[PDB]
């Protein structure tokens, strides 16, 4: 291992604004105390979550000083920032090294030539998250762009000749695959090389594919002089005989591509990347095909923040979230609304999740955000290029007037996406139900955020909606890319309409259950919906607003913002999606009954269950909306206390669930 | 497929010497009838086999005239002779294209630049097999250098830029192995390119390794301008992970190495070579290690003549010798005493034999053959470099005075081999039995020829010998490079001592047998003999002499010169070595019995056997010198026909060996 | 110093052939009187220089008898002969110790084991210098192979185990260098070890690099048992940080390498070798580069014979020749046409002279010299491997029909050199002016001998020639490897055309000068002549012909065969190449003036000078062909005598040259 890659998150100091305009007064602030801070860090962990309309949104500086030894001579040095919100500028000994716009993509710069080796060197990052009309997202409405260096920073050292590390901060290696099947698959490996010296250098580029297990499947080696003039691009092609296909969750098989730069027989640099051999196809009105086989697209969504941590997460948090996402039986995630961690993306390769990635072109257009949107779209693609999990790039979400501009912008994003990577689908999302909205049809897939029975019409209205779409647009690939409802666990009641006035501060868990129960059943029976994505896997922060009696919270989670509690619909989905045995009674949290003659619901994916209200078995059980949904229609409750217990069996094994409801007066 | 390589064996005429000194008479000989002939050809096939000390040795001329089309314009044209005995000159329309001395190595000369295209051209090859002090072998005493173009001739057509056809007649690629084990191996591919043009040329060298089954493993690619000034050399480097190793007869796995030169993304030249990944190591005292595992070295030897063909053989012939070697259960072969056929070495790679390859420096030194000796060594190695099967190069055989010189010479040879291929062992062979002969120790491995009980002392003196040697020099890698006895199938008897005059004309089959039955059992027990090669798998011509009552014949083969009859030793080794069932009564050819009460030997590698005399099981069966060796002595013979049937069953199959004897009165053929 | 290397030139007796053919008569000859003689010695010093086409080439025997004490027992002894013309055979007490072919390379042989200790032993050497078709050079046309033991002989004493003294007579250690720059250089040392005894021996090999001043700057040490079986090789590698680069004449820095073999914490053997760290490189069309910097390649040649002595030279003579080379301003020497003395090579290493070593494959091919040619090139390379000053190995010089053969040869030689020393260039030399010659381009560099105005065309034709090569073959490395004109001092005239009849017996010094004056002017302005080499720094014997009114002499020397007079052109080159003050008036030997109105030519490499006719400054001084060239026309001569005084100054010293002619009537020796 010749390349050196080390964590650089340690020993930073931080000074937050706002800063005075007078230089006399500014210099004082600068000279004052800096707080000592660990990366990942952010300044909105509290003020973007605890209240609404009240969070700091401007500049902050980060400072660090660091010895660089003399053995770095003739080496090249790099800083690679995984993520900084939202604009950043790095200075090394006062010299500007790089600047970036976009609080969700990585970036690197060569600092080598600005260091004084054998000395101490001062690194400084100016970070600023105030919204500007030329950078997406343009406002903080749907969600807030937590400020600061909220993903890890790396030090990267290489030789004078290297696999480029500053190609949009990409790995510098791009793998593509063509004509993929059980029988073969042509892999192409394109590598970008750079010779920072002044003379041509004799080198060897050796690209190897390894099996998951570690065997050499193939080798392609090339000797040549590496020009010092410009970065150079080299190709390797491999013909894979009977490749082990990456088959989503059943068989997430991953080959390993290793790319080595060699000089005088020795490795001077190397990059490794994953290779999940597979093919993705969408046939409109039919569905999604993985390597030719129809594949279930049970979609969920996930934001990169945790209660308390803001978006300054570690790997346990991404892992913990992916575990939940797996356990509920999801097969596809829509990581809205912006590029999310690469570590997270790599886990999806490994885990077998088929996933969707997006740029934060959301909520409003200003007319000034194109160059930056194109720019964010490209860093996303180039940095995430090699992940088999990825199937589509998301262009925009809920952007409208000026229509003509919004459609031009979307068109050019689609176009960049296909220049940059013609092998994947693109997608874009509208908030309106109708197809021919002036802003639609600019991508491969048209996506629609629908929330029947919550913002518009009633829960059941989803059916006539979808049926009418496929009747008029049999050929469009359509996805339902957002749906669900809020659920404040403190809010409980069995008196429910088919809609809910989302203006009044009462978000009853049970209305969420009711929405997913019915709605999932429509989706399932309408293949024309190629993929559906419930919103959202967890509750996340929304600093711009207070609703449903808790501030700055979107409570549409299947799980609470702190990750501690799973709502009813969690077990509904897992009951319908997972192969794992679920046996679940609805409404454990609605423990102070309002009525005498109640309904009892139980979820089971392992057979007709038995329920025993207070010692004794009820009956009349019947089916709900799906063969996993069981209902007892007219249950008569005892005063004081009641005790519900449920029991089914499979594989000579026995499953339990008991809740405890309370009743007295009404 | 860019390179045209086609047989050039047809339409030659021959004209043997001797030739008059007088131009008048020579001109006549020259203008007379030439014999139309076919290659491979020799002129000694008969006179070197049928009669002792009387065979022609000198000049002979071959001629052939060939039309070469205008299509060769801009192309390169070569001739490649796989072997000519013993010195060669080749003329193209009168212009001298090349010279070669050494009747055992390939040679090639470019000739394109001499052709008249669109016209007819004349090739003459002058062949001479007269012994001369500056060329090995320096005499015809040990065997005879059959004259003639006795191996096949090839015509090779190339482009202006190519992989060199002309580097000691080698393939032009050189393949190397370093650090070989289960887990990995470093493979180097050295390639030589020649641009015969006047300006550099844009080309790409692409080298590939395929698996035995045709699947690509790795490619190395390089683009550059091929310099028009001197041949050039390029290296590829592959790193195999968990290579499938080449494991002798158990698993002779062969990768395919392909080197294509390209121009305009069009292939313009290729060369394909085998690759057998393996490590050879010898540890004095312990034995021979193949990829870390001990490996039996049951060795035989093989000259390259057949009765009646001389050395002008065809592949079918080489294969037939190889089949037999395989079938006797051999695992190593010493191809004495000279470079042999490439098809041959090649087929060993494929069969899994581990082989020893040798130059004809032998019998005598004269002191004027050093340059030639080195030249043949180098060619043997370069032409043979790539055969996974070769583990050693043999420097000399039984050369003595002048000691100082012969030692110098061996030293330069050992050294030349380390220079040209430091990855293989070198050996040299002494006729005497003592380690400290003033000519020994100049190579990696010391071999010794020992014919105990035949030229020297008793059959059993081999034991004391190996016991002393191993004690006194526990550290020398040492091999028994030759042992055995003559056997004239026409000679039989049971009156055998423990020695055999070799000066009388009675070389009885029974005595050879007796030698191998015993000596094998000593070799088997002393790993200090790192390997043993018996002499010989086949009888061969020795035109110099008449021993044993058959003129010009060495009769120590386990099989007869015409390849038609296996002797008893054939089956003795077979039983001792092979793992195919063997059940064989000896003396089937000594059917005219002398004594009424005699012994009866049977060979069995599949359990102690039953032997019925005239329908009546015998008893007394006792152990010979190895677990496959049983004798019942003493049998009492009936008069007239006696029938020995041997039986033994193994796992639902039963085996059977029946021979017929005849007795009437007591005799003794030995007292003649 | 564990090893004893002592001089062995003393107490030798000689006895030239031809020798009677029948034994009685020969035995008488043997018992005749032998001439006692001092080594170095040739028997051709006389008949190869004093007259043409009449020298003795044939056998001669030397004989020396010697006492070897008992204290030599268990030790090993060797003879090393630096050179013998041309084939040798050495016997010790009438037993063949060794044999050699080629009169320009050392050979060696271990004689110890044939010695009889505590006694007198007798060494005998047979030398033979008769041309043969299998030994290069195949004839004596270009020069004669003075016969006999014309270079020193050494007796060498060692232990049982040593750094081999017998590997092609090389030093036994080989030093390579890779990736060389100011920053650093990796040097690999290779060492060959021999264990003469019967048992493994426990040794330690300690390799050290010392600065020119004596400071241990790298040590590599190893311990291991030295196997008795075959000679062994050991590598050492030194990463030299910021090495002092050998930079030609600017600064010929030399580390030295010391290889010590030790046993029981003691030293048993040692060889020490030079190490001139530098990189050489040629870029066709641009020039010659030395550690990355373009370097002038001002070249001359030198044969290894002196008037009177023939080739039996001592060190003083080599030294003498070198000084005149250094002094003339030379930066590179071509030692045509054969391996030359190791002292000579060594001294180039010291003066930082950059040199080209060569094998005498010249004039003719016979078709039978290949093996010997290879042989000589190998010994030349191995023997001179370590010399920093050598940058190229020359393979052949003016050899033509049969082309195909000659080309096969050149190619095989190129390859031998690439095999044996892949780091140096190779070159071959053609007499023709055209690039696409059938035997050209088989080596890294193409050198061409060109004598315009002498063997063909005018003196000025070297201009159109070089202009067309550089245009037509921009990519080829091209050296002008010979050019010049004979110059016989006795001959003088100003009647000079553009070409000269080399065919009649007048070779006027004047014509030589006129050539070089113009021709060096052209050479200087075409970088496409990477290097040029004038023929010849010295006149030399050519025993076969009588050219230009003197037997057996090539007279293109700058200096004379006895090393006494410097011809005009000598100084012409000192001006153009030298750092030193030079002022010189041409034609100081052409005093018998042929014309009243003549031209005076002066050479200053330090400003426009002043010329004085009798006593009155001359006028009209104009510029000649290079900046150091000044000419006066048309000076009028007095009657009787005139005298000429040139004068010029700088840095406040005076420079002054005076010669003396005399008009006396209108002459014209040229027509006479
Ligand atoms: Cl202010
Ligand atoms: Cl595809
Ligand atoms: Cl390379
Ligand atoms: Cl005659
Ligand atoms: Cl190995
Ligand atoms: Cl590996």
TrEMBL record, chain A:
Q: Where is the signal peptide?
A: none
The GO terms this record gives for MF are: beta-galactosidase activity
Q: Which SUPFAM superfamilies does the record cross-reference, listed alphabetically?
A: (Trans)glycosidases, beta-Galactosidase/glucuronidase domain, Galactose-binding domain-like
**Which residue numbers delimit the Glycoside hydrolase family 2 immunoglobulin-like beta-sandwich domain?**
173-278
Keyword set, alphabetical order:
Glycosidase, Hydrolase
Q: Where is the Glycoside hydrolase family 2 catalytic domain?
A: 284-575
The answer to whether UniProt assigns keyword Hydrolase to this entry is yes
The answer to whether the entry has keyword Manganese is: no
Protein name as it appears in the record: Beta-galactosidase
Q: What are the top taxonomic ranks of the organism?
A: Bacteria, Pseudomonadati, Bacteroidota, Bacteroidia, Bacteroidales
